[PDB]
Amino acid sequence: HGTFGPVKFYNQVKVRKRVDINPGHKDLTSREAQEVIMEVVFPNEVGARTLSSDAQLTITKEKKEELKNCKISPIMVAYMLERELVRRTRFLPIAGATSSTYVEVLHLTQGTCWEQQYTPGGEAENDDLDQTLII
Amino acid sequence: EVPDLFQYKSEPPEKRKLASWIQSEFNKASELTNSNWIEFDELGNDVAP
Amino acid sequence: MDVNPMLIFLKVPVQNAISTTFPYTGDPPYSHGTGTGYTMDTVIRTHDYSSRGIWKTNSETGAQQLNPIDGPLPEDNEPSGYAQTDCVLELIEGLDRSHPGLFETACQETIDAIQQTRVDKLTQGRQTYDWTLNRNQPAATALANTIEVFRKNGYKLNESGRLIDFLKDVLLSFENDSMEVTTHFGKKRVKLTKKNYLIRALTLNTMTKDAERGKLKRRAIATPGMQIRGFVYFVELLARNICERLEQSGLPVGGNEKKAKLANVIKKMMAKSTDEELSYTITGDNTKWNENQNPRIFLAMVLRITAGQPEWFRDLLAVAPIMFSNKVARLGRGYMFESKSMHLRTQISAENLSDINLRYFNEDTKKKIEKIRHLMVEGTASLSPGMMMGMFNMLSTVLGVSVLNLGQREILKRTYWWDGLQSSDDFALIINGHFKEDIQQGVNHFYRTCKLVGINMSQKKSYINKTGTFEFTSFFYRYGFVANFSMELPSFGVAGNNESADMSIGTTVIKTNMINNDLGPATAQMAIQLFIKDYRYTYRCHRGDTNLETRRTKSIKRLWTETISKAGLLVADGGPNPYNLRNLHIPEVCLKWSLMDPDYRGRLCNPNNPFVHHMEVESTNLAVVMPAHGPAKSLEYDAVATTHSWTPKRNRSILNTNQRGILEDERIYQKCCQVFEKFFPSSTYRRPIGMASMLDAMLSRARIDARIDLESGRISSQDFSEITNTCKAIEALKRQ
RNA sequence: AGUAGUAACAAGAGG
RNA sequence: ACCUCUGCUUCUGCU
Ligand SMILES: Nc1nc2c(ncn2[C@@H]2O[C@H](COP(=O)(O)OP(=O)(O)OP(=O)(O)O)[C@@H](O)[C@H]2O)c(=O)[nH]1
Ligand SMILES: Nc1ccn([C@@H]2O[C@H](COP(=O)(O)OP(=O)(O)OP(=O)(O)O)[C@@H](O)[C@H]2O)c(=O)n1
Ligand SMILES: [Mg+2]
Ligand SMILES: [Mg+2]
């Protein structure tokens, strides 16, 4: 659902910074993710303590509801949940938009001498828009 | 006890000097022929400009 | 006209065409046969650089131990190990003063780490010297062997599961009169003497480094045993925690982050300079870094960094340096000999070198053996000086950085000053001053200070120029970092993991290089085409409509003729290549999902298939790659698990050896672990905790699972009873 | 012989 | 002779 505009040619400094690399994370720490994934995939092995956060709780229910009767290996389900739920970053040379949905297609939109104007399909984050509005 | 039992030869290589044939080979390597030597596999269709 | 590619440099700046100077389309150099020669070389050189120091005989091992610390000062520019304790201490104090609270914090974190670290952390190493066998083994196998032999000889604090308790066992094991191990003639109990055991504990095995680029000649590397590894781990963690907060440290930051840090350092420097100052940069390397590092100095560093901290922790961290001061090197595999006259050949061992007749050897090797004889002890070579390759990368980095830290204007108060960045022995030093004479003096001050702490700048490897261009570990800066695509060429190919992992790795490599190493779009397209061909030939998964003959042709042709939507077949199933620039980041299975005959898709993605060998979340979709330069890297890849996610067969050579029994032990262990996981699925995700036996946990779980299944109606009352019955019979059978 | 290149291969091990 | 097994496994390290 992406849209392509023109390619332009110019020199631009691509400055190295840390950027987000996985759109759709739920901004959990690894211990909150673990806690959640334990509840979702292996509930009876949770141990003593349980989830304070309400974010944790509504994710759990959603995921728990999405993945009932699931016969894909629990290893892959936990692996994917961990990849999805935790914010991951990387240092990349990046000239333009730093949002994760743009980072994801950096190889496509940015070259040494070119920009391929592009808009990914889907909604922006309200956070990203607010941030861009200020800039 | 074998008298000539000895460590394997472990010396520097024998030296050799430049000859004209290597430059000549390289000249020929950089030249056009009238054959296409490399066949490339297919790509997905081009979409982005 | 004679063609000369070098003439491009008449027009194109060397950095802008640097890619062409890296010949990484050919096989890199390999050693053949023994490394014993290279081991003797490093042992000899290491002593030579420290030769004016003091010899002692070790009370416990009998090893001859050379101590060059606080020895006579260098008198020329030859590599020196005569590091001076008081100078090191001044530098470390300087680092403490520049960074108040840094030592305390890094110590605090290291303490927490010591309390929390599990024994199984040591499973993360690669090939490890295994003293119970006097042979190398995978890290986990080496750990298990140590634990097992320890417990049989009465050391088992490590049963706690805490690394620190295993460390206690290690020190306590040295009090034993005679450590019993078993060798395989069937099975024989062998008793090591206290001295034997300690020598093995203090051993680093040695071998030669293969596949290293950029060098005519080979060199030796080393692998420590399990007695050493847990202590080194914590010293290097402490040092890492410090390095992370030093602006002058190049570790542990990696590629892009390293470049960002270097660029910041230049920017910082220039802002702090006056307009009237000259600025020069040394592209810097050190001679024989590891051979001139000294365990006694590391001991000093550790005691000074941990000043004011609890004494148990200071003493725990001091262990690694002490062990290194007392280390020995196994001398490798020995040599082979040959008789022309009798057309025969034979292997002698490294141990034979103690007393073999010298007539068998070339003059060079005879001289080496003569020199090494006074160091040999129960088959090893005493090596008190040096650290050996890469053993304390981070702590050694702290030493180099401490010299960089000295260069502040307010410390020197000279007509010059310096700053820079250091990673191990590699550095960029920026020297500023009013005139060229100031620069020279500053460079001499830096160089001579380094000498005083056993750091020896390589004169032939280093050079200087006005600031603006420089090189740092194959990153080229010309008023900003330029690309070096050729460094990455070896990574363009079929990785050899499996069909699923390799497709994802191959497309990602292309994409990453477009982003990071200026791989232009046309060449990226051609990279896709070249990869697909290599994948098809490697895996014999030519497109279903082709007429090549392989062992796979007929079965792939049937799949093809029978398929309705061929565009949905994976390449490994004889399908077409879907990739272009825009979709390199999309796993093939996703990309083709909507185009797949539903039956193929349901087979391909059948979770019940017998091909996929899942193991652990933490090692899921992980490959190991060996880059052209530097250590092995773990590589994450994005892929759907399918029947293409298979595992190639294991090596079978051990079947012909006395060690074949190990295969059986592994099979048994795996069977026990597998069944355990049928009761505790979460154990594939996180590691389970407990002092309970595997059996007890499985019994408790079966019972209470069967009860909930009963109430919830997942199971009959008959089934349920048989489960609790089976449990009771297991309970009983467990009493003989 | 040839590969190679500081030490190896030119099958090893076992029966 | 001939038989059997093996093709990274006595040798691939460190942050
Ligand atoms: N600990 C450790 N350090 C390494 C390793 N590989 C390289 N280094 C260090 O990193 C430095 C940079 O390597 P490169 O510049 O890529 O290669 P090089 O051939 O040593 O360097 P040049 O002299 O620039 O040709 C080396 O000189 C070492 O100091 C490794 O596997 N382990
Ligand atoms: N594969 C490698 C390469 C390097 N090193 C570490 O990096 C240091 C610097 O490497 P290098 O400059 O290549 O070698 P030196 O030991 O300094 O020797 P020289 O420069 O004189 O060749 C080594 O001493 C060692 O501690 C390592 O552990 N593993
Ligand atoms: Mg060096
Ligand atoms: Mg170096």
Side-chain angles (χ1 to χ4, degrees), chain A residues 1-2 23-24 99-102 104 119-129:
Chain A
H1 297 103
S99 180
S100 65
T101 53
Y102 287 89
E104 161 178 290
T119 308
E123 290 288 80
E125 271 294 305
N126 283 337
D127 281 346
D128 287 356
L129 181 63

Side-chain angles (χ1 to χ4, degrees), chain C residues 215 219 284-286 289 423-427 461 473:
Chain C
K215 297 178 196 311
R219 55 178 162 189
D285 189 275
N286 290 285
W289 177 253
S423 163
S424 158
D425 102 312
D426 310 287
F427 67 97
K461 285 175 58 174
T473 69

Side-chain angles (χ1 to χ4, degrees), chain A residues 4 16 18 30 33-35 37-38 42 44-46 71-76 78-80 82-83 88 90-93 103-108 110 112 114, chain C residues 256-257 259-260 481 511 514-516 518 521 581-585 607 614-617 620-621 636-639 641 679-686 701 705:
Chain A
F4 288 111
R16 285 164 171 97
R18 188 170 221 80
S30 291
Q34 279 184 94
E35 280 188 4
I37 296 167
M38 283 297 301
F42 311 111
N44 296 317
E45 309 193 45
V46 151
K71 292 185 200 171
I72 298 157
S73 161
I75 295 172
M76 293 313 300
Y79 168 86
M80 290 305 304
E82 198 157 68
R83 302 295 287 170
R88 285 175 289 112
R90 169 168 289 162
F91 262 81
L92 293 170
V103 165
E104 161 178 290
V105 296
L106 196 60
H107 64 284
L108 174 57
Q110 172 185 289
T112 70
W114 54 270
Chain C
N256 282 319
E257 187 168 17
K259 284 173 174 175
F481 287 109
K511 177 195 89 177
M514 296 174 73
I515 297 168
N516 290 312
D518 290 3
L581 301 183
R582 66 177 180 293
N583 54 15
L584 285 172
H585 60 308
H614 289 304
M615 289 210 65
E616 259 184 345
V617 170
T620 290
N621 286 13
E636 292 171 357
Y637 58 86
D638 291 339
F679 291 92
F680 294 99
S682 96
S683 65
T684 64
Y685 172 45
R686 85 190 339 189
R701 176 62 154 189
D705 276 3

Side-chain angles (χ1 to χ4, degrees), chain B residues 4 6-7 39 41-42 44-45, chain C residues 339 341 360 362 529 577 580:
Chain B
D4 70 348
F6 207 81
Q7 194 177 348
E39 237 173 357
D41 278 4
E42 74 287 9
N45 295 351
Chain C
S339 168
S341 76
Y360 305 111
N362 64 41
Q529 299 180 295
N577 169 36
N580 204 327

Side-chain angles (χ1 to χ4, degrees), chain A residues 4-28:
Chain A
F4 288 111
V7 165
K8 299 168 158 172
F9 285 84
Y10 55 82
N11 252 325
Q12 197 179 20
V13 178
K14 304 152 182 70
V15 168
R16 285 164 171 97
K17 57 172 282 157
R18 188 170 221 80
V19 294
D20 294 344
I21 62 165
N22 65 319
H25 65 77
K26 268 76 169 53
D27 205 4
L28 300 181

Side-chain angles (χ1 to χ4, degrees), chain C residues 20-41:
Chain C
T20 69
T21 69
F22 284 82
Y24 294 184
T25 57
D27 49 289
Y30 279 78
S31 67
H32 318 222
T34 187
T36 291
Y38 304 124
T39 298
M40 288 195 300
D41 292 344

Side-chain angles (χ1 to χ4, degrees), chain C residues 224-238:
Chain C
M226 277 297 160
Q227 287 94 344
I228 288 171
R229 279 171 174 253
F231 296 103
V232 187
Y233 169 76
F234 285 123
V235 172
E236 281 290 284
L237 177 59
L238 167 66

